[PDB]
Design a binder for this molecule. Sequence first.
Ligand SMILES: Nc1ncnc2c1ncn2[C@@H]1O[C@H](COP(=O)(O)OP(=O)(O)O)[C@@H](O)[C@H]1O
Ligand SMILES: Nc1ncnc2c1ncn2[C@@H]1O[C@H](COP(=O)(O)OP(=O)(O)O)[C@@H](O)[C@H]1O
Ligand code: BEF
Ligand SMILES: [Mg+2]
Ligand SMILES: [Mg+2]
Lengths: 156, 467, 466, 487, 170, 85, 54
Amino acid sequence: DPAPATTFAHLDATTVLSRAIAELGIYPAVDPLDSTSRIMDPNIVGSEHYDVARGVQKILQDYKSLQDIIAILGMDELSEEDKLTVSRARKIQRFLSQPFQVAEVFTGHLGKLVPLKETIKGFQQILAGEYDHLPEQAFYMVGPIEEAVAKADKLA
Amino acid sequence: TTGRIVAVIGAVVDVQFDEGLPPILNALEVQGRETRLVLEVAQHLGESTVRTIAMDGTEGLVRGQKVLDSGAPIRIPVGPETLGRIMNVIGEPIDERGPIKTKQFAAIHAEAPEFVEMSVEQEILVTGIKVVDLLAPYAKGGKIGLFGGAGVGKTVLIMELINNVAKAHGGYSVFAGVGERTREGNDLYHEMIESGVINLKDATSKVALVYGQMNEPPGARARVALTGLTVAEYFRDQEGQDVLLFIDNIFRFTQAGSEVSALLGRIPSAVGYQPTLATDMGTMQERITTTKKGSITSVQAIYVPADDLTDPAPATTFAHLDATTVLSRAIAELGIYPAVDPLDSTSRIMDPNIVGSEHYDVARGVQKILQDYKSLQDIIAILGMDELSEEDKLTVSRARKIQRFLSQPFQVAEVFTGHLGKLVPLKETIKGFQQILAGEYDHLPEQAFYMVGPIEEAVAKADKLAE
Amino acid sequence: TTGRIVAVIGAVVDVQFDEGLPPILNALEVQGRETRLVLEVAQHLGESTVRTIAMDGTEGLVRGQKVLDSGAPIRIPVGPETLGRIMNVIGEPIDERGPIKTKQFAAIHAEAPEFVEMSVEQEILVTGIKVVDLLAPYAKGGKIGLFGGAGVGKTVLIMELINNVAKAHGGYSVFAGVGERTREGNDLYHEMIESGVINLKDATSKVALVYGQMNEPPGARARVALTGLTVAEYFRDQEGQDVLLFIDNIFRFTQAGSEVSALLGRIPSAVGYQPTLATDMGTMQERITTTKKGSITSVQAIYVPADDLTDPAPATTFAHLDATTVLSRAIAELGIYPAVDPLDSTSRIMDPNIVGSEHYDVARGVQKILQDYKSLQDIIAILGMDELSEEDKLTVSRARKIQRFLSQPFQVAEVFTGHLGKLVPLKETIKGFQQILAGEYDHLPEQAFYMVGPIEEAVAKADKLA
Amino acid sequence: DLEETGRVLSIGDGIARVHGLRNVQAEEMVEFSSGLKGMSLNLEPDNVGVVVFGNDKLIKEGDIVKRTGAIVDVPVGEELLGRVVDALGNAIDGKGPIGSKARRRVGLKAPGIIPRISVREPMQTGIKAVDSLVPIGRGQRELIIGDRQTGKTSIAIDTIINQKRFNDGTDEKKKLYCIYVAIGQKRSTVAQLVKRLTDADAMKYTIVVSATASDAAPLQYLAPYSGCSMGEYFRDNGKHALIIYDDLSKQAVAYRQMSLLLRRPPGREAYPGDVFYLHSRLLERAAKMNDAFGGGSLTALPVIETQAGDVSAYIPTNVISITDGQIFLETELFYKGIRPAINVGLSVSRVGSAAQTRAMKQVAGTMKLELAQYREVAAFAQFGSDLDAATQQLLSRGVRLTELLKQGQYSPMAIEEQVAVIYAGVRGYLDKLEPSKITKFENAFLSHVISQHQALLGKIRTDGKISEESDAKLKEIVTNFLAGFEA
Amino acid sequence: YFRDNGKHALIIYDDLSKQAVAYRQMSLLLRRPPGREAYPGDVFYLHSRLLERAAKMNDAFGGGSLTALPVIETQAGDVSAYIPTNVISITDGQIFLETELFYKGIRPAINVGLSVSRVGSAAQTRAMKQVAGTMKLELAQYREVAAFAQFGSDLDAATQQLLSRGVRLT
Amino acid sequence: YFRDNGKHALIIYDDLSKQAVAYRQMSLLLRRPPGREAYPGDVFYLHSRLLERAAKMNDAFGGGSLTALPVIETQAGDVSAYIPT
Amino acid sequence: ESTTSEQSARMTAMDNASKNASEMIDKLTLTFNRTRQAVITKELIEIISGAAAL
Ligand SMILES: Nc1ncnc2c1ncn2[C@@H]1O[C@H](COP(=O)(O)OP(=O)(O)O)[C@@H](O)[C@H]1O
Ligand SMILES: Nc1ncnc2c1ncn2[C@@H]1O[C@H](COP(=O)(O)OP(=O)(O)O)[C@@H](O)[C@H]1O
Ligand code: BEF
Ligand SMILES: [Mg+2]
Ligand SMILES: [Mg+2]
């Protein structure tokens, strides 16, 4: 639409929220692949932050491209390498959800604020395969990675 | 009669006349200008005012400036002295070689040949291009159209045709550059001086050049195709001759018309076009034709806006053609060049009684195997190659070889392919495809068929690939 | 009073009046012409000029030619004499049988019945066709969307409705052909004569026909549904009957309206339709209802542009529909007449609070078993009709007897077939099906239930096969 | 005199605005000082909007325009046969004037509801797919519709060619006069066309009306009405005509040009609100007259070009609802080898059986059912190893019947030839013949029966149907031939 | 000024999408009736007369040049739209960038089959021609065959080799 | 009236889709520029100014309230369409 | 034991793919008609705006 399309050029950072993502219960409903920032530069954020960010987006884009086949044939027809990116991608998606103080009535969870370092570490660890054993649902609606691990143990 | 400019809005100039009103299509000359500024009369508005379209820029025009009626439409030099020369829309030389000293001039507007003047004669014009010759061959004296979106290969194709057919043609050629790149006009002019088709020294020039490119205002682009066609009409009629007419790109005559339509007071038709799109095209196209007096083989590049063949402009052009080559971006994207759609190119002479049952049966067989593959593609892309019978996958391997064997390196495309250009005789084209259809090369790899001339080059390539 | 034509632009004529202006919707009569040219006032442009839409070709018209304000909207013959006759949009007869001899005329434009004149009660309109009455019952004064189209027995079903309504309710019928193909109008006339519902001999015709043929200007095709409606209004208001109105077809009413709107220079709305799409439809449809005096019930054939049910034209129509009757080619090829899809056709009044609590549960029970029969149809062409449980074999045997029991011999098709016509009472239809479900006929053979009326003929036919 | 004459106020784009002519009627043909004709489409308070029949370089502001007593009419009668004429009936083939005795107005009402009888007499095209599966009757309007280059004109030409077998015979009832209306086509295309009709000796019973791409918009608009009037000469004199409008797409474009330039309001795709009306009034003029009215007919075969298969576009929508049926052509069928490229699942004729002879009716009924049942399964073809024998049978009968519907161009078949061919497939004789051999088989089988069994064919025709005797005779011709074919 | 004085200039128009929008505003306010997509009828000509001025001059005119890199913004990856194809139909090639490529880690995110140069090897040094001469077509065929191969089912040595070469060149 | 006098009312607009269609009819007859789905630019304001009037008043203004239940008809579950959104 | 398990699984998986394709068909048809309606409307609004601006 002319209004939003014209607005993009006026921003240094854009957070694009998606109804599709909302309807999956991911909150906040940010499209990881449509939101950008003029300071996502290794010279500004440092190379570890930059590299983890780019790695997350790659796995998410990789997963997105496998989703045509998933919709018709399902998980079973995938190779073992593709099943892995799918399961890591789905973990990353959920780890990007977060309980907001402002939304406690809707989530039924206490609000969380996550320090940037703990954000980098969490996703870095998921990407590195350190949590392939934990189930998806453990990464949903938590603060730091520690909470998803505690949540994993609680799910017995 | 002397008139005065009363309104200027872009390319559209209104002129009031005190005495006699110049008829529609008359050329007016603006006074007080450094270079000739012609206005063509388009409408009588009433109150002794005419509406005109300008043939050059209207910057510097002042209300009250004087305009003279020339008495006639734009009249251009025709005859042998146009050969080797470059003209603009109004017939001035733009090659910096002085006057075009012909005996005769001709109006760029004229009636189309009558029904009784029509010829039905049609024989194949072999080009050396495998896909064209095989599936939708051109006819001598026929109307050929090359359709495609922006950057898919129209001009490269038309340069290959010029190379393969015009360079050793008996009679005369006309090339009209209409709303295309000036760079391309310079490329072509020097290529033809280098090849001797144009000769700056003697009188053996075989091509006349008319240019009104995309740096020109719309009035110029809307009339320049008529200028070129007029040069070709003279050769067809007043020398009864065999003529080659090349136009790149005829869409730009329609587009230029659409640029000024609103300023001419027209309500727009669908997709933003002038309501007169089809009649405008008719009265122009119907002059581009063979008659009993002479033959014209016309080849017209036809731009397709937004890659949509249903666009009013291309859609209305189809019925003016005897053979069509449709280029596709989806095909170019794959590296298949020329990017011709084998299932959307057609020819009036693709008949077993004209090309023979062997050419025809092969052509139709190639198209069948490509349609069958096309209809399998998306299914096996999901259910897998394994679910196919050992005959469904045979036509898959064969169709993919045939898709590759329709590609071909053009002489004129060496700067892009890195391959030496190939010209392939009709018999060899037919035989090559006959053979793949018959199973003769099921043992060769797909890639061996990519970007070669004759079928022997694919066997050669297969050995080279082995390691 | 007398006006002069000041503009002719196709089907649009501007007329200037020296004195008092003809109000919007008035019929104007053009003078100096072979056949009657009527103009309907659409706007007052100011300066004593009106803009009008023509009901016929305007070729030959001259500026200054005289026009006569008739003082009213279009007025047409109404009453028992319209029956078995064919008139056009301005009420002229076109069957060539001379004039139409009625005491009353009526204006084709009329506002809908007021709120206080509204029945608050929802009654079934018994057709006597088993499929309809049991599963998707017509509502008295409701609108019914007839789907399927050409090939599946729409014309036979139409003629049967005229028959069964003039029979079991003493109600007459009107047929309004909006954009009627001339060839099909002739064909229809003669089919109706041959089936009896029209009679050129006496005065026992059951249907008036009103044709606004495809080759007429858009004003004419836009107005015919109203002409047809006016005719029908007479029999409800003046004679107290439960009337039947057929509109074939409603999309062509929308289309003509869209055309007239275009010609009047109004800006098109979404998808090219008239801005007045919903009110054009509303001011026509609302006239079809149950009043205190009687009721009009309308059967309307719907064309769905692009098979797109969200298209403005079908979507605007559906807001007015109380039922659909879906004629299906699949059913026809299985020999079940009438070829009504018993699961695809629906009724809004199929509600225990409106029809029986017993009517509702029989219909729901019929539905569930026919839906359940469909599930088992994959397990048949795989395992054979024996691997089923005793519960599952029972529902197949009962469902198939129900399918066949939904068929019916029509009186209107006695000539082509040979079988005698059946008009089944509502309580007998409900009873029949209730008992096949109960198992009170499991001992009987399957083809005992085919092409019979009431369940009493299923017994009589099962004995005659022994 | 500003009642019988006017003066030009403004001129451009084929529209002249004329002060005066106070007495012109709506749609009257006027005349400009130069000699050009024009037609008065817009009568406005202060001007007449005149549509120009020619090049407007010949008309200036101030030009005198006159009413003349003119009527828009055309020459009519059998002196038009074998002639090629423009939209107003002038000869353009160069063979001298038309020897016409009668004339007829181009704008006239269709016969009303009463003077007609049901459509019952076959209009044979000679095309197996059409004659069997989409049968056309005398007085029907049947649309030929599809994208460019799908074979629309070819259906029409084959149809015209087929009529020779009746027009050469002695039975006057079966005869059919042909009208081809070329609208917005290029001249050389029309030349190729009449050439083809000449070499086929079909021109002698064909009128060609031609309003080509460089003819003015008003001429292309009129041309189909003119040609219709010529056909009505036949319809109203106990005779039968066939008219092809090739195509109505281009006529509508020419109308839109005029509407837009007269500044009438634009609707969908910029078409005026009376464009439906333009075609409905044309196509209702096709009719079957009753005996009281002479028993004559005018069958119409309008042609519409779609754009990328969009049959729900504005003008296709219009002509589809106006006609009694449609023949749908498809690009994809065309390249698969289904030529003619008729979508037999979608194509429909509402007349149907009523327009088929008993013999065709018999076998066509079986073919229809077997092809429908084939279509249900046709995607298990290249994905079917372990299908039940019953459905391998549907697949096999289906691919074979499909091959029988394939037909070369320029060779229309007599009905009894068509039933012999269809019989062979619907009786199962070709079920073990490999599908690619079928068209070789058919070509050969038909030459044979046309050669040695003119009497079997003479009788399949005469008995109206296929007798028990014809059945036995066909059984032995087919079994023995087939055995010979596969030797 | 550089072009006509024996010098070489490079111009970047960043971007011409926003220029066309500005032209459209001005044109509509001047009350010139809108054309396709609300832009004026002559939006092609807006850019065509601009970009034609990028040119290489002959020695008699001083041997200078002006090279242009106009920028167009697409919506939802649609290079096939009206304004995009307008501009493609003016220039001597285009570099088409895609977000899908970008996120997958192909940066610069150039789509090979859809990008083209209309000058080709004539604008390369011989050394670059010697190594790059056939690569573009090769990489187009690589992407097609990679897709057709997608499910690793018995592939010959020739396609296996093209795949191996393709992934490494990428 | 109720909201402003310490009373509680409930209003149902059945339905606001049909109202918007009414308004588009009026706007197009006024030759206002059609936008998305041929709706005028002010179709949002039509509903916004109406539904803002449903409010809960504090004790200082009587404690009354108006509760609104507008009805919107979607076409085939499409909640993303212009009027629904 | 194996083919019983294979042909059960394939039956099931092919059941699911068929139902998944069927849902996607429904969803794409809806998208088709929404796009279809908007193209008509957009094309018309262009014609109107041009006509009006004169
Ligand atoms: N036959 C061909 N072989 C190789 N590359 C080609 C061929 N045709 C076109 N191309 C590529 O596409 C570019 C655009 O082709 P061109 O003919 O200029 O497009 P247009 O169709 O717009 O005239 C060429 O400069 C070249 O890079
Ligand atoms: N039955 C047929 N068999 C083979 N080719 C055909 C057949 N019918 C038509 N064609 C060919 O198909 C092409 C398109 O046919 P044409 O009648 O001109 O289609 P249209 O009028 O739809 O453009 C022509 O070259 C024609 O010779
Ligand atoms: F860009 Be191409 F010359 F149409
Ligand atoms: Mg080019
Ligand atoms: Mg044709």
